[PDB]
């Protein structure tokens, strides 16, 4: 709740989604997340965040954000994402569920960190592994 005011002020590149809706559409997205991407809030508005992924997005990765969405739980993950224009960027992802007083799931916020080619080259690498273990 203040979390949310705490991103605000921490200009972070964020948007919250409503998982009440068909298709968990984003309902809020920060001028971080516009100036990311290059997206107007009408193009994303009442829309699902899928379309920052691409063809060379690790369909593992997006798995584990699809599984922590089902399970109403918080995780994070380094994977490509995609501007408008159809250029890319490393993601540093972080994902939470907000719960309601009755411990109930209201919505997600998913905050972007643009990172290195040095920082991604490391971190994917960790996740491969991960993926390898089990
Ligand atoms: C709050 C929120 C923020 C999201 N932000 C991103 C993002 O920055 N990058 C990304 O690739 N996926 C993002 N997604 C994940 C997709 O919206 C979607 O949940 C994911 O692709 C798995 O579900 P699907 O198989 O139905 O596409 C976000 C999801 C939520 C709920």
Do not use: H
């Amino acid at each position: 709740f203040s979390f949310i005011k705490a991103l605000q002020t921490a200009q972070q590149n964020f948007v919250v989604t409503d998982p009440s809706l068909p298709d968990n559409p984003i309902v809020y997205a920060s001028q971080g997340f516009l100036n990311l991407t290059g997206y107007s809030l009408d193009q994303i508005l009442g829309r699902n965040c899928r379309f920052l992924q691409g063809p060379e997005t690790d369909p593992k990765a997006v798995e584990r954000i699809r599984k922590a969405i089902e399970q109403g739980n918080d995780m994070s993950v380094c994977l490509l994402n995609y501007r408008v224009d159809g250029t890319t960027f490393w993601n540093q992802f972080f994902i939470a569920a907000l719960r309601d007083a009755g411990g109930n799931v209201t919505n997600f916020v998913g905050v972007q960190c643009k990172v290195s080619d040095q920082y991604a080259a490391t971190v994917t690498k960790q996740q491969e592994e991960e993926e390898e273990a089990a």
